[model samples]
Target: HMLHNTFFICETNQIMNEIEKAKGIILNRNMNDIWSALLIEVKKSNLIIKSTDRNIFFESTISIVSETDFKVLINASNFYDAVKAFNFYKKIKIVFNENNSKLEIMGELNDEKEEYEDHLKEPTFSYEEIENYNYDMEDYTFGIEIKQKSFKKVINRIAFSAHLDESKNVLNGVYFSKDEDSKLLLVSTNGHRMSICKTEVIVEEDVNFIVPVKIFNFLKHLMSGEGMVKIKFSDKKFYVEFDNYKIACSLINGNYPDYKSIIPKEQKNKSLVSLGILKDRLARVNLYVDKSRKLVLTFSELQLKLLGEDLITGRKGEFFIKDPNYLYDGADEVMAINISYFVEAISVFETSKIEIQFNSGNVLKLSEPENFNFTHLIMPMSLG
Candidate 1:
């Protein structure tokens, strides 16, 4: 058994990159032996590394010099740091002594004059003998290949609105679905405001799933440069494969609320405001408000007034702006809303001009003037 132990040599850079990529999936705490450890499997010509929190899984393959096959587990963070610390070396050799339960890492320092005896020893971890630990793509019901930047942008546009509360499992993730035209739609809401964005992708079959915000955030960090990411999914799990890395995340098991019905179909009072001007005014007024941070907007013909007040200190600030685009034909309307929500919605608009629409109810809609693909709905604060 000692002589049959697995041995492999790989480039420092190659292994370090894979380690960094897998770090996102590693558990923060050592809950158990398997979850906290990074699983390294050596095959005839490839070294595969994997890490998982039991909910999110990541795997990457690195070409290596190996003949025998074996599996070992090591502390994920420790292995990452060790690989990074000895990054100056061009190559590193890994040897396992199965009989003694010991592992050795060998490398040479990158200096011609100094003779460096670089050998590090650590207690080896034992893994259950399993055929393989890899995600099976054949089980996926649907798959799509999307441009990396497009996917990243869609996630960023909606993920901010997702509920951060752990109890709200359904709202704590971004909703992925397809429209009648097969365009990919991403949505997120926190009961106060909702964000929606649409993008084009090649889809094999229409499928819907809610991806936890944490997974989308981690995927954002993993995407680098320009390329395509192949996304495949079933009802219960989702997978993203790009470059040499693959990530599998468990889907939130619940139905997302019917978001389309919440949007107002009849918004009679419409006004076009300059995004830059509105943003600046709100920032100035926000300084005077306290915890509530309520903003009052009064819309009249050809004019708009913004007001904020501090209840404790009895301080108030007001700004009136005149713009020809500010159109309102009905009676003067005053709306009280959270300043933070308005600020967040305005920040996502790419154009200089934004269209604000109000219905008879407290729901307000904000959108780009020309691009109907994106829409944001924010609930106004109560005046009481």
Candidate 2:
């Protein structure tokens, strides 16, 4: 047996603060393979953390002040459990009993020994240079406010459009790109129809990134409050850095389908509606939609309507719009859509009112009340 004694004596709260700062990144791992699912590299300037499920990967670089530089690649779960035992106010010392493969965390009145698995492996890569090396970019910093639950919903909805089956296409991920109008657009589609979400954020230069489902989930967990987050992108990869967190993700390599054509020209058919009111009603409407065929929305000048059926029970629901405050010109045109697609796009935006435009039967547009910036385009499914 090998025993290693190490002491980190800090105020209970200060230690907790450091642990909490790293918890978001450290906790991210593939639950299926918890034993070897994470890589932690400690450097003079920071601690670099990374995890991947083979196809998707996340690399984070965080800066901190420390006494020495050491690298430890261990199981993610073991580290998490060790950090959870400290009392908030008492001073604590962390002693690694390498001889016994145990971690002893001692506070004034309490001490505990926890057995850690012995699968620690030597790291194959150097995080020192990787964390500090600068990549070429025209970089800008900005802040976005999205509720944790809300952003997760957006990711979940958009991810459905990504290609999970491999034989037909590459692993198509959710693409986040902005238009010349400065509207933040999220897109995921194969050949059929595209599910799109458009929202507005203060951005000087256009930022576009295609996130595989794996990376997207990691990003979602890191976002909080009105904090400013920095983003940098290279031709093949995207970098997102925030308070105590950074993520480097590779971009999708294949040519993404040209999405410009999916946006229909401004037609006479359009309606203005309270975004919150419609979203709540649609949530219930989507409950009975068929899985094979997306719930469809038809929009005209006078009203907006949704139609979907559950084939199993032969139960169907049709929700119609007839609000005086909502302007709709019945003669504008008709469009059909996936109800979830609409719900997902509108759910992330902050505006109270929204404009929805319909052209022919395959394209729909969602825009902000004021012409400030943002437009969402969703492609319709062929009802036939």
Off by over 4 Å in 1: 1-7, 30-33, 95-103, 106-124, 128-138, 201-206, 276-286, 298-308, 315-331
Task: List model 1 lDDT by residue over 1-384, tens digit each.
Answer: 453447888999889877877877665575244556777888789988887776788888889988788877777777777777778789887788777666677783354534567677655565442223333323888888888887886776787789988579999988988877887788999999999887766454776899888778778888874899998888788889998788888899899999978878878888888878888888898887667868888888878888888777788998876765355655588888888888977887778888888875568889888887888888988875
Pick the lDDT winner.
1
Off by over 4 Å in 2: 1-5, 9-69, 85-91, 108-171, 174-213, 225-228, 293-302, 308-314, 332-336
- What are the per-model C-alpha RMSD values against the true structure? 3.8, 7.1
TM-score of each: 0.81, 0.66
Q: After superposition, how far is residue 10 of candidate 2 from its true place, in Å?
A: 5.7
TM match of model 2 to true structure: 0.66
Worst 10 residues of 2 by lDDT: 117-126
Worst window of 10 by summed lDDT in candidate 1? 129-138
Cα-based lDDT at residue 154, candidate 2: 60
Q: Model 2: per-residue lDDT, tens digit, 27-118?
A: 35453334233554445655565654444445555454444444443445555455455554365444434334334555534455456522
Candidate 2 accuracy as lDDT? 0.57
